[PDB]
Design a protein around this ligand. Structure first.
Ligand SMILES: NC(=O)C1=CN([C@@H]2O[C@H](COP(=O)(O)OP(=O)(O)OC[C@H]3O[C@@H](n4cnc5c(N)ncnc54)[C@H](OP(=O)(O)O)[C@@H]3O)[C@@H](O)[C@H]2O)C=CC1
Ligand SMILES: NC(=O)C1=CN([C@@H]2O[C@H](COP(=O)(O)OP(=O)(O)OC[C@H]3O[C@@H](n4cnc5c(N)ncnc54)[C@H](OP(=O)(O)O)[C@@H]3O)[C@@H](O)[C@H]2O)C=CC1
Ligand SMILES: NC(=O)C1=CN([C@@H]2O[C@H](COP(=O)(O)OP(=O)(O)OC[C@H]3O[C@@H](n4cnc5c(N)ncnc54)[C@H](OP(=O)(O)O)[C@@H]3O)[C@@H](O)[C@H]2O)C=CC1
Ligand SMILES: NC(=O)C1=CN([C@@H]2O[C@H](COP(=O)(O)OP(=O)(O)OC[C@H]3O[C@@H](n4cnc5c(N)ncnc54)[C@H](OP(=O)(O)O)[C@@H]3O)[C@@H](O)[C@H]2O)C=CC1
Ligand SMILES: O=C1CCc2cccc3c2N1CC3
Ligand SMILES: O=C1CCc2cccc3c2N1CC3
Ligand SMILES: O=C1CCc2cccc3c2N1CC3
Ligand SMILES: O=C1CCc2cccc3c2N1CC3
Lengths: 259, 259, 259, 259
């Protein structure tokens, strides 16, 4: 039950949320994992510990993904620790809601530096280091293409940008035999989801009980449940298999068919 | 190396081409396979034989997919033979080129009966029989969304229709715990490819040597090679795994990043 | 205020609904209009009368769009009456809801014959007759790409097919200097909307008062109102202008930004 | 022949290229135009002069669109000069080709500051100032969604981002009665096209004669010709008409059906 045995994965923002779920599912299948974290050092070591309990190797490495020089440092350290890399999961990100009239250059820069520029440099580093048969997977969101959501231009734009990076990088990574895809999840139970899901729930309002949100979202899902980090980690695991080689340069929505 | 052990798959038009590649890759991973064929009985038994050599169980069952009553019969027989079904691969199809002015109702009907109606009924039968955790996968083509291709409205329209079926059926199959996706391949080495690839090759013309076509197409691929039935079968295998559960209602292009 | 002066338009199913709104807006701008109708003869003559009151010329011509030979007859008569054609609006269509398990070949055929095959032949006739600078516009629906709607595979698939026709026909009509686009409306106040809108309203149920439906849909629209046939006719008018020449082979959603 | 009579338009980067073509076509139809320019002061005054010869009013106003405070200043001046605004055309942009490994933070920032951040602030200013019935139109490119193009991640990503802004801003501008759309042109004869078109021509190479490029691109167009700034200006003119009100939150490809 170890299709990824002998491979090395790097996941940005793997200390918690989706990042953690991806790190765990990759490790459960044999991959050694570099658990990057921005500031959640304790959560990251906890993930390394969870990996160990699953028989997987891992290492927590701090790096501020919104700073390109730190992304380069992160990769240098990861390669120094595990000797090479195969899979790169660009996951770090932030939600953001703001009246467009109130958006300042500072807020704009903060959002794009992490959500977009950070992913560009993580992808550049993947092109630089990923071994043949490798995989680079960026993170967009269904919000990049959704309609009817207000005060969300920074988030929608920063995620849509990454979809353009995916198609470009797939061409650029071809000679190296590394595929590049982009995942676009629907709602997934995490801290970000608990803070922002009301904006997506049918009839949602600020202050709506989380259980009601969860129920409204699950009811809009063909599978009648909300997604969890493990659902994303399992799908990413499948994309990391040799079997997924012919899937390249694609934006894949991971929604269970819901929202 | 048997993630699909104990599962039963049905593949329409599995006697040759992509269908055969899908049947073989599913069987290589543990699935028992119903090899449907329209008229290629000998190729189909050959596939059943190849499956046996891989340690997989298979059975060839004739059914004209362009006739709904025969699709229903095909499923009844498949269920009678293997006791149930988990994965349904709707693959049968035909290419078609025609000056739009020259298209007759008869040609229109012939194309849609197989490429579209056939897939609708195969999907209906999947909803009717697929067990929980099951998978239904329809076959479109990148030609459904390509621009610049002449005399191809019947093929483009018949394939685009199936993408609408995919989103609809995903909602309809949810309660049963069966996901529904659609694959849209780029060029894949088969009889259809050898007869029709010139239409897609850059600078292609009728009569262009097949080796030149192959070289032109491979050069337009990031992976620097053309796709083969095994590439499609491997990707479909990954989609049939439990790990792919959160991918639902999606049209996934299988192109290696090329055309 | 007559940008379409001297041009001749043919609109299928122009006796009522969206078709009527398109016929009226084209005539208001100078076009002579062939008002096709399947069985609503009285509504069609009413439209011809409304056109006359606007100073536009029109003629009602019966033709069952689900029968290719009648589509050919319709065009022969239209050309006999006005001497040529410039704009072809393929609008006739039907909604359809059905448990996929209950769909029969007869229902399938009925839906595709009108919604898809009919549009293919109307487009073929446009290629055959449209004068240089002409326009062919097909009708899809946002339902072709929507997710989360149950018992709707026949409608979603029959409309998605037309999007493939649009891209194909644009290539095929180029030499003749005729552009081909496809409109995909959101909800538009008509008989079809009054019978089917509950399926699209947030929290909709069969039996929900139409005023509540209208209010729920309008609230989901940035423009805070539901669309009407005139909104569609105005947009189609703009697409029929010489100014729209560079828009070709596109599926354009006409939703006011809503649903 | 003045559908836009009495309206005021602002076009970023209107001194030359597509921007100039848009300014001229809007003015030809009655709009007073604010011709913004970054550094081409002489070209901009030339455009103001061309507008005058067409009987349209115009004013050249310098503003570096890559600097948000200057975008705000540009709008303050435009409103001071013409008393209000109706149409905002966000057009300024740059092409960029670079081996992804060689991209520096400085290059990244330069590209996104103009192509993406600049458009966000132009859109914010449109929301702030556009009168009811107004229009905001952003500029993407078919390159945002194209496959097979190397060394182009910064351009593809910076343009794809704007498509996300379009959907978001359409929701945000609804209450004010201002629609927001995004145009995605194919090749259009301009300085940028003459410097970069080889990258898009079938079989293109650096150093390919421009006439051969033009011929190769035109041959890939259903209309058998390359697009020009006037083609874009005419389409934008149609989108600025009252008739286009129901088209909102859409990315419209302006390609004549080609590349
Ligand atoms: N949850 C959902 O429903 C959806 C989420 N997404 C996307 O999935 C990704 C993860 O989301 P989710 O897990 O829910 O997010 P959470 O907010 O729960 O956690 C986000 C992660 O981003 C990391 N991170 C933030 N800033 C930095 C930084 N500057 N440097 C390095 N790492 C950083 C965080 O780690 P740290 O604490 O150390 O800073 C954390 O691990 C994001 O890109 C998000 O936009 C997309 C669709 C849906
Ligand atoms: N090859 C390519 O590059 C691409 C192919 N596709 C699609 O993939 C699918 C398979 O293509 P490919 O393998 O290349 O095709 P081939 O023409 O090589 O074989 C097609 C299959 O369809 C089956 N079939 C045809 N008619 C019927 C029928 N009436 N009833 C039952 N089965 C039937 C054939 O079996 P039999 O001999 O018994 O009739 C055959 O197994 C098709 O849907 C095609 O449109 C999509 C994109 C690219
Ligand atoms: N209303 C909405 O919200 C939306 C509608 N649409 C599409 O827009 C189009 C028009 O919709 P709408 O006006 O609301 O529809 P209605 O049901 O109100 O009217 C439909 C039209 O189709 C015509 N028609 C039906 N069958 C035939 C036939 N066999 N031959 C010739 N004409 C025929 C009808 O005329 P007759 O009475 O003579 O048969 C009628 O004029 C359809 O294609 C529909 O799917 C798409 C998105 C949204
Ligand atoms: N030409 C084509 O084929 C296509 C073009 N596009 C897009 O269309 C838009 C225009 O393209 P095109 O006209 O060909 O471009 P050119 O390079 O010919 O001209 C671009 C314009 O951008 C302006 N500009 C550049 N920087 C600034 C700045 N910092 N501040 C203000 N204005 C600035 C320039 O004016 P100035 O000289 O004063 O700096 C110039 O008016 C761009 O967004 C481009 O990406 C999209 C698809 C195709
Ligand atoms: O990007 C995000 C963040 C949070 C969230 C909560 C619920 C539903 C959805 C989201 N998305 C997309 C759909
Ligand atoms: O659908 C088909 C059939 C045959 C073929 C040969 C080469 C390339 C491509 C195809 N496609 C899509 C792209
Ligand atoms: O196709 C149709 C038919 C009727 C209808 C009523 C309300 C909303 C919508 C529709 N659509 C798409 C969106
Ligand atoms: O964005 C650009 C810039 C220049 C150019 C030249 C030719 C063809 C095309 C472009 N595009 C898109 C398609």
């Amino acid at each position: 039950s170890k299709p990824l045995a002998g491979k090395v994965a790097l996941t940005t923002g793997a200390g918690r949320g989706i990042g953690r779920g991806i790190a765990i599912e990759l490790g459960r299948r044999g991959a050694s994992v570099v658990v990057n974290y921005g500031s959640s050092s304790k959560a990251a070591e906890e993930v390394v510990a969870e990996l160990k309990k699953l028989g997987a190797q891992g290492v927590a490495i701090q790096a501020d993904i919104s700073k390109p020089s730190e992304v380069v440092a992160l990769f240098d350290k990861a390669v120094s620790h595990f000797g090479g890399l195969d899979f790169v999961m660009s996951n770090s990100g932030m939600e953001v809601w703001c009246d467009e009239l109130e958006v300042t250059q500072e807020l704009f820069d903060k959002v794009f530096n992490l959500n977009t520029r950070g992913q560009f440099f993580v992808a550049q580093q993947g092109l630089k280091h990923c071994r043949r048969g490798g995989r680079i997977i960026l993170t967009s969101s269904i919000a990049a293409v959704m309609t009817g959501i207000p005060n969300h231009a920074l988030y929608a734009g920063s995620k849509a940008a990454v979809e353009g990076f995916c198609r470009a990088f797939a061409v650029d990574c071809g000679a190296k035999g590394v595929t590049v895809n982009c995942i676009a999840p629907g709602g997934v139970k995490t801290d970000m989801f608990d803070e922002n899901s009301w904006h997506y729930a049918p009839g949602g309002y600020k202050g709506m009980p989380q259980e009601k949100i969860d129920e409204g979202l699950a009811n809009m899902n063909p599978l009648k449940r909300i997604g969890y980090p493990a659902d994303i980690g399992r799908a990413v695991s499948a994309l990391c298999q040799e079997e997924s080689e012919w899937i390249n340069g694609q934006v894949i929505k991971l929604t269970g068919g819901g929202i």
